[PDB]
Chain A
């Protein structure tokens, strides 16, 4: 394990946020690692000193050391290698998730939280099996294109771009990250996209998602901060720290 990113000592931070970038040097494709940069940027704006550790193959993971886990996407080969190492982190990630701490998981990382995924060529690769969803393959087809979803628990809309062959089906104890307004979503069948279970937020969205959805960036960081320091603290407003991004998100229309 090593620290890949650290806030400067150019501000006086009242809080500390430690991010475990799971397999961040193997699951590192398509710009999804820019989610880490967006987490750091939002956290600093809220007064948090950010430390990002790369926790990858053969690293031990201690749930108590981290306030956010980010688990992104990668290439098929790297993804199968990540899968081989995950049993070493199963017990600690299960405890982290059961303790309601914050996870953001994208593509392959989202898939690997679940039961298994199946490559396009039919090979089943077991996942952590912590969550109940599973992912089937498509023989030739891929779900590719712009996608827009809406989460009715929060009343938030998220936009991005999908490109995946896997078809994920959620288990009964899970919610979707959002219901599909247009796009294929997890399976093209049930209008779901992603997952929301406790404080695990999963998605197929490229973008990166937090660059295109600052609403979700704020949600993840504030949830993490209130989890660590308690629901009674008073954080700066979404509109006040992210005014520029909220308006420019709309100017795109």
Chain B
């Protein structure tokens, strides 16, 4: 039909979850293409799906595969229109109740009970409920330590079987990792796809082993490793050879983008968007890995596109700055006063935290600093303004 018969012609992979949908989809498409040729996908996404399937060069007698990013809320509706063969669940985190958001994708997959679910085993949500569909799991199986609590600002850490607090033999970020309830021994399932080795990780790259083969990406962040893991897992499930996964991966890894780097005088600068606590903490954990001295600038606006509420910065892990090679700190943006205070409270040297009322001043200061590198963390409208001021030079 308008979208139904294509589910019979195509093997349809639906990629859903809170974060990483777009990147996991783009990387999966690129690996599957190496094995199977043309892959239908929605590079930005229901009636518009009809044209994508209609542009297709392959016909009915060729191996037709679609990898589609579907929003968590739109899944029950689209699962009536088209029947996927595989669901991929990247993760679930809270918008600004998660168990209600998980219910929608449980429902959407229930509409295609034969389809396999490939879920992030490291999320305790994805083992919270009994499920009709066959499930397999990917996750991190690197070296474990003794069970320890996640950081107290972490969300979603109750055991769904006994309502005690989960601990972790390995915690990557947020509530992800090798979780274990010490009261009822509910715990992370055996992983079908294993990241077994983290071999090198920097502020701008990582190398890791997944099911006996090594991979390298050229951006930092653990969350990006999860995206590569999920895609490689889809390719293994589709039976793609290790040689073809590697070649497909290396052709498609550029979808990760690069760090937004530029120059102010002789200083090399990186600009990073911050918008919520887990995201900002992941950026701080990334830049902490830099092996050189650097200045840190943090730009906080409260405009509409930023989120009028700035209380979130108190849950971001800015305490990490005392463990970083930071030479001097700039506090900018409209709420330069509130961010300066957030940074003082970490115990960082307050004589090295300088407030600036105008972003231009931030640029002049970075321009004359002693250190060769500068990191700039910026909310959204502050990032746009900061790029626009760089244009004028």
Contact = CB atoms under 8 A, between A and B. Distances in A.
Interface of A: 2, 4, 8, 10, 21, 24-26, 28-34, 37-38, 40-41, 44, 54, 56-58, 75-78, 81, 84, 161, 206-208, 211, 245, 248, 251-252
Instruction: For the complex of A and B, list the 8 residue pairs with the smallest distance between their C-beta atoms, beginning with the closest.
Output: A34-B314, A31-B311, A31-B314, A25-B152, A41-B345, A248-B337, A37-B345, A24-B152
Nearest to B150: A25
Interface of B: 94, 97, 99, 149-150, 152-155, 157-158, 163-165, 309, 311-315, 337-338, 341-342, 344-347
Interface SS of B by simple majority: loop
B165 A57 contact: yes
A222 to B, nearest CB: 18
A145 to B, nearest CB: 11
B274 to A, nearest CB: 14
Contacts of B311: 30-32, 34, 161, 206-208
Contacts, number: 78
A58 B338 CA distance: 36
B152 A78 contact: no
Contacts of A10: 347
A211 B342 CA distance: 8
A129 to B, nearest CB: 22
Given A2-B149, A31-B311, A76 B97 contact: yes
Nearest to B152: A25
Contact of A33 (B165, B314, B346): B314
Contacts of B312: 31
A34 B337 contact: no
B346 to A, nearest CB: 8
A81 B164 CA distance: 9
A211 B338 contact: yes
B152 A21 contact: yes
Given A76-B97, A77-B99, A28 B337 contact: no
Given A25-B152, A31-B311, A161-B311, 20 more contacts: A2-B149, A25-B153, A26-B165, A28-B155, A29-B155, A30-B311, A31-B312, A31-B313, A31-B314, A31-B315, A33-B315, A34-B342, A37-B314, A41-B347, A56-B165, A75-B94, A77-B99, A78-B158, A206-B309, A211-B342
8 contacts: A25-B150, A31-B312, A34-B314, A38-B345, A40-B345, A41-B344, A57-B165, A161-B311
